[PDB]
Amino acid sequence: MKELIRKLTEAFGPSGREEEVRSIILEELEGHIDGHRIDGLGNLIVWKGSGEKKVILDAAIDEIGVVVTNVDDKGFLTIEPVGGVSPYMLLGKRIRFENGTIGVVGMEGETTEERQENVRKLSFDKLFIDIGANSREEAQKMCPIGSFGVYDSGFVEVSGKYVSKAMDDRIGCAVIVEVFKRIKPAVTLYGVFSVQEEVGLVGYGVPADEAIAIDVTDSADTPKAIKRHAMRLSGGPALKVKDRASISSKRILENLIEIAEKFDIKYQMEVLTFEGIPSATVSIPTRYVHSPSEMIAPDDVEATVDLLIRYLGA
Amino acid sequence: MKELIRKLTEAFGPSGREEEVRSIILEELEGHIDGHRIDGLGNLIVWKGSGEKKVILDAAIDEIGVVVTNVDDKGFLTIEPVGGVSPYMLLGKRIRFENGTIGVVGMEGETTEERQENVRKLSFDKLFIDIGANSREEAQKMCPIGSFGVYDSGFVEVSGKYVSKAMDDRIGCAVIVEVFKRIKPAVTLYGVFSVQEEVGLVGASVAGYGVPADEAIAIDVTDSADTPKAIKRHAMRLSGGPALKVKDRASISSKRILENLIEIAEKFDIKYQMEVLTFEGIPSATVSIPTRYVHSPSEMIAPDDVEATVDLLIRYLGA
């Protein structure tokens, strides 16, 4: 599973430019699915099996990133966020653009007074990206306005933990792929690798009896994160307790609990403080979400795959 | 090109199930290419020649159709479209499946008023496919959920025009094949017969097919707007020649390819027409075959347009 996770987390796929991730998914699934198609919205749909019950597993394919919005007369790029990237996570980071260009993130201000004022109230308009260009025309041919970029960070093992960009939600994609690689399905099993619509803009078309979202959830097990209901690395898949869950959705949750208990699979119940298909959410606990170094525990990922295979497999 | 077009248009090739299309392309190209490769996604790449300039010709191999999404207790199939299939195009039509299974498309509603209401705003949820099965078990064995179907129509000559399913974009595939059959290339010529990698069935999706190239030319279809009550203000029409696509935000190198093609057409006395504007790694142009009734089971082309397109490409790339 390690190489699968490496390939999916390192793949280039910010919102709108996900073709490399779709291709890796399809190449990983060759020989393990009965068919596939891309729907009208760009969602990748795969399937395997023929049992009477139909179940969807869905995971988001997009990753956070940046988009180039302007180019100055000296070749420096202005950017805005794609998804939830904090400007604080970009300071001094390297960005990888779609065509392979590497850029360095800098912050405006020279005196100690102005830099400290800037960093205390850091916004994207105080950042720029240096791609080594010396003029606008040179930068425009290298990295035109509208180009997308993502963290120039990759996969690494950190004493048994896995660290990479885009664990949210490429680890969910990896779980679904691995289930398809291993499973002899007792159901008709769909995998949906879904694109995200921009916040402020306007189901996957396949009918099914159940849908299970494979997501990440924040792992609240770092220093001074002393809270009740905390999800922790190595505590197993996080099963989401939704306040307004339908009767049918609660039945799915109960099924997964009984499966995990029956087969000695670690799990934890996610309670949050403060579509039409019956649904459940199973999440991988993840530290440092939306940073270049999101961290997961491989045993949680294995336990999640095991849970889904027990529940859906022959 | 008649037999080539008949074979390619009639071949079964919906999303992910294009084995018959790729096999026909390679049999037609035997003895006319230097090599070929089928990548991990099903794209078929062929090449010929050794000139310094490298040029890609690309056409899509997938055709529109339906996919089975449910089967009821009486063996009737529920379907969703793949590509631009209109539900109105399917009423009373026959659908062909991979193993040769034929199905009949029906619509729900028994009273005349219910049927009149359903066709006023026809939706796929009111359609079903009857494959002759008498139970879910019988239907699932013949046509499992997830099976793809295509139009069960074939090639016919209609007073000198060619009519078939899947001219979009098997006619582009035919053009590329015929170019490789005849050309003595001045370039290194690559032919890419591409599967769906975007939301649309046709389109390279701006991910390099593993071939570095100096130019790429997509061979597509375009709507022929020369049927009754079409007001032809620069409309594309059958027998007007290949349609050269004007692109609004085109790069300098892309407009140069278009101008090259215009100059070839005029120097070699080849008819052409300009597909006007309606309202980035490799420079690209698009050349299209005018086609009537796109996305119906009876797409219609004029053979002289196809021949002129082949001629345009041979003369552009032969020297």
CSV table of N, CA and C in Angstrom, one decimal, chain A residues 239 241 250-263 265 267 269 307:
chain,number,residue,atom,x,y,z
A,239,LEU,N,-15.4,6.5,12.8
A,239,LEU,CA,-16.8,6.3,12.3
A,239,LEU,C,-17.6,7.5,12.8
A,241,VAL,N,-20.5,10.0,13.8
A,241,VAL,CA,-21.8,10.1,14.4
A,241,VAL,C,-22.4,11.4,14.0
A,250,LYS,N,-28.1,5.6,10.1
A,250,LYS,CA,-27.7,5.0,11.4
A,250,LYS,C,-27.6,3.5,11.3
A,251,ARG,N,-28.4,2.9,10.5
A,251,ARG,CA,-28.2,1.4,10.3
A,251,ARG,C,-26.9,1.0,9.7
A,252,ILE,N,-26.4,1.9,8.8
A,252,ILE,CA,-25.0,1.6,8.2
A,252,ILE,C,-24.0,1.7,9.3
A,253,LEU,N,-24.1,2.8,10.1
A,253,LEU,CA,-23.1,3.0,11.2
A,253,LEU,C,-23.1,1.8,12.1
A,254,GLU,N,-24.3,1.3,12.5
A,254,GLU,CA,-24.4,0.2,13.4
A,254,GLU,C,-23.8,-1.0,12.8
A,255,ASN,N,-24.0,-1.3,11.5
A,255,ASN,CA,-23.4,-2.4,10.8
A,255,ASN,C,-21.9,-2.3,10.9
A,256,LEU,N,-21.3,-1.2,10.6
A,256,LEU,CA,-19.8,-1.1,10.6
A,256,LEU,C,-19.3,-1.3,12.0
A,257,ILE,N,-20.0,-0.8,13.1
A,257,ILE,CA,-19.6,-1.1,14.4
A,257,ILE,C,-19.5,-2.6,14.7
A,258,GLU,N,-20.6,-3.3,14.3
A,258,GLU,CA,-20.7,-4.8,14.6
A,258,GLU,C,-19.6,-5.5,13.8
A,259,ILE,N,-19.3,-5.1,12.6
A,259,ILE,CA,-18.3,-5.7,11.8
A,259,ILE,C,-16.9,-5.5,12.5
A,260,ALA,N,-16.6,-4.3,12.9
A,260,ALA,CA,-15.3,-4.0,13.5
A,260,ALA,C,-15.2,-4.8,14.8
A,261,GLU,N,-16.3,-4.9,15.6
A,261,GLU,CA,-16.2,-5.7,16.8
A,261,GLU,C,-16.1,-7.2,16.6
A,262,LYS,N,-16.8,-7.7,15.6
A,262,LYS,CA,-16.8,-9.1,15.3
A,262,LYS,C,-15.4,-9.5,14.8
A,263,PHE,N,-14.7,-8.7,14.0
A,263,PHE,CA,-13.5,-9.1,13.4
A,263,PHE,C,-12.2,-8.5,14.1
A,265,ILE,N,-11.3,-5.3,14.7
A,265,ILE,CA,-10.7,-4.2,14.0
A,265,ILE,C,-10.8,-3.0,14.9
A,267,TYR,N,-11.3,0.8,16.0
A,267,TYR,CA,-12.1,1.9,15.4
A,267,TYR,C,-12.4,2.9,16.5
A,269,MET,N,-15.1,6.4,17.5
A,269,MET,CA,-16.4,7.1,17.1
A,269,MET,C,-16.2,8.6,17.1
A,307,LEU,N,-11.9,-3.1,7.4
A,307,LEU,CA,-13.3,-2.9,7.8
A,307,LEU,C,-14.2,-3.0,6.5
